[PDB]
Amino acid sequence: IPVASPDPALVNNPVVAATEPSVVKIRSLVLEGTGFVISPDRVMTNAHVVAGSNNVTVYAGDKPFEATVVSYDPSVDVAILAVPHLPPPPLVFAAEPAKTGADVVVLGYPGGGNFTATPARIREAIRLSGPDIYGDPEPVTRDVYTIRADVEQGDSGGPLIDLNGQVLGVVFGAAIAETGFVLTAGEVAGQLAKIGA
Amino acid sequence: IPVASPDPALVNNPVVAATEPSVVKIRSLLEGTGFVISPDRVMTNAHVVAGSNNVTVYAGDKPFEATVVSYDPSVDVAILAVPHLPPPPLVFAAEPAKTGADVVVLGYPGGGNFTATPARIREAIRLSGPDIYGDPEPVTRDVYTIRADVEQGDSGGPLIDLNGQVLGVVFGAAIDDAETGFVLTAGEVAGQLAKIGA
């Protein structure tokens, strides 16, 4: 779905500074990604960043914190880390769906470098379906937002936020088109239940 | 693309009887199908056997201990080593299959008995998905789409042509389109194996 290009000024939106401390860098095994605080001392990230690792570090404002995988399943895109002594507060998920054309922001760590807010716009909420690959862990079907944005693998596990600073979903991929894929809040809810989070 | 319904008579084609001994049931600690590609070597679906330390291959309705010897999370097929496995290798077809061609899926639906599932080639296509971050599997694959009553138990099984040669490896089904299977082409399989030095 064609939407207007994202608003470049979003990088300087006050929501970015307000949300930034709760968006953290993840280093595993070396696999790199983004996560965010979802409750005190608990970080959500992409399962593929931490899969099978007993050696995960979370970085919040340039300082390392030991992390332990506490909720994980190969059939699920998201994972939860326990992070003792993690100062930043949790982010809160938005109750209702984002709307077509809405200004939104991807927050994360492109290239494993510094924090960057990536301006974005909601294209559409869709049912993303693939072929049933026999025995393949990945879900066959996911509720996602397609967003107009130039996302990068370093943003994986990072939140898509609305302008209120609430979390609309989790970045997990990109079209093979200036189009990112984001798990919806409802999709995340269902996945969390699966892993006992 | 739409093709005629598969020929039910294919179940009775002698080439099924001739190739059957070389098509094996796989149990791993998941169930699937495999086939002999060289003496004591069985090709199957990577997902049936991924990370598994306990794999049994059944050939004469007789169990054989198997081990995953070629595997990578980025590759859809795996090779099993199976000491003292009697049946001979199936041979891969040198030529691609055409639209409308009579073909047969050989495998073990539901982890039960050997069944030949009549099939027909729809098309050779590129199967593409989104770039799922951190997912090691191929974003694109050369496959045949086929018309057939496939089932997850068939995974890792050969799609054979009327010469009893292997066109590809059964690896999935369509969710929206009924009676539609996906089969990794011979070239796709060779290419993936080469990537991991197998």
Side-chain angles (χ1 to χ4, degrees), chain A residues 1-53 55-61 63-84 86-175 177-197, chain B residues 1-26 28 32-52 54-60 62-175 178 180-198:
Chain A
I1 282 194
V3 294
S5 55
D7 186 345
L10 287 170
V11 297
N12 297 315
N13 195 287
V15 79
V16 175
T19 303
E20 180 167 352
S22 305
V23 178
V24 295
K25 178 182 300 180
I26 299 167
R27 258 215 168 207
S28 179
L29 290 172
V30 178
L31 303 177
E32 294 170 344
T34 303
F36 60 100
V37 192
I38 60 159
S39 63
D41 284 4
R42 294 292 183 273
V43 166
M44 178 175 288
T45 188
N46 197 297
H48 291 103
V49 175
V50 299
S53 181
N55 214 117
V56 186
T57 309
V58 164
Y59 298 86
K63 283 161 186 180
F65 296 86
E66 179 81 292
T68 300
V69 181
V70 292
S71 310
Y72 168 86
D73 191 274
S75 73
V76 166
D77 301 305
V78 298
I80 309 298
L81 305 165
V83 190
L86 187 63
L91 301 184
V92 181
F93 282 83
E96 300 306 329
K99 263 52 215 72
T100 339
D103 292 333
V104 292
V105 199
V106 167
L107 314 172
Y109 297 87
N114 298 335
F115 179 88
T116 288
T118 297
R121 193 175 301 276
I122 302 293
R123 295 185 182 276
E124 199 192 349
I126 64 164
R127 190 171 165 110
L128 180 63
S129 308
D132 173 18
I133 310 304
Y134 290 149
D136 193 339
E138 307 278 319
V140 58
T141 293
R142 288 174 275 241
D143 282 355
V144 305
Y145 297 112
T146 52
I147 59 168
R148 180 159 185 188
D150 288 291
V151 170
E152 224 132 33
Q153 189 176 175
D155 294 312
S156 185
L160 180 76
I161 62 158
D162 62 27
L163 298 188
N164 312 291
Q166 292 193 329
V167 179
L168 288 167
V170 182
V171 177
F172 79 106
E178 192 198 0
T179 301
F181 292 118
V182 173
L183 308 168
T184 66
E187 178 64 35
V188 172
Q191 289 193 21
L192 283 180
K194 279 250 278 190
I195 60 178
Chain B
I1 50 145
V3 297
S5 42
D7 189 353
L10 284 165
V11 303
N12 289 147
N13 193 295
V15 86
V16 171
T19 56
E20 175 176 358
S22 303
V23 180
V24 299
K25 187 157 67 175
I26 300 183
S28 95
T33 299
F35 60 100
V36 186
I37 59 173
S38 69
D40 294 357
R41 295 297 179 272
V42 172
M43 183 173 286
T44 187
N45 172 25
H47 299 289
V48 178
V49 294
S52 174
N54 192 322
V55 187
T56 315
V57 160
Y58 298 86
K62 165 164 164 41
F64 295 82
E65 192 182 347
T67 69
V68 182
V69 291
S70 305
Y71 168 82
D72 192 87
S74 68
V75 171
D76 295 310
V77 297
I79 309 300
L80 308 180
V82 193
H84 306 287
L85 188 61
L90 295 187
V91 176
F92 281 89
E95 301 292 329
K98 312 182 214 177
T99 298
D102 284 338
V103 289
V104 202
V105 169
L106 308 179
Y108 299 85
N113 285 356
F114 175 86
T115 111
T117 301
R120 197 180 296 279
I121 300 290
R122 299 181 183 271
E123 189 181 23
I125 58 157
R126 217 148 319 97
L127 179 64
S128 294
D131 175 10
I132 305 305
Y133 293 145
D135 185 349
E137 72 194 342
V139 170
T140 68
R141 298 159 171 107
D142 285 349
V143 299
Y144 293 107
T145 44
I146 63 171
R147 177 165 182 176
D149 284 339
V150 280
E151 202 270 331
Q152 57 183 168
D154 292 322
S155 90
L159 180 76
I160 62 155
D161 64 17
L162 290 172
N163 292 327
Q165 294 192 323
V166 179
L167 289 167
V169 179
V170 174
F171 106 114
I175 284 298
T180 299
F182 299 102
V183 173
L184 301 164
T185 67
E188 178 65 27
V189 301
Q192 292 192 22
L193 287 178
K195 271 182 188 54
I196 60 159

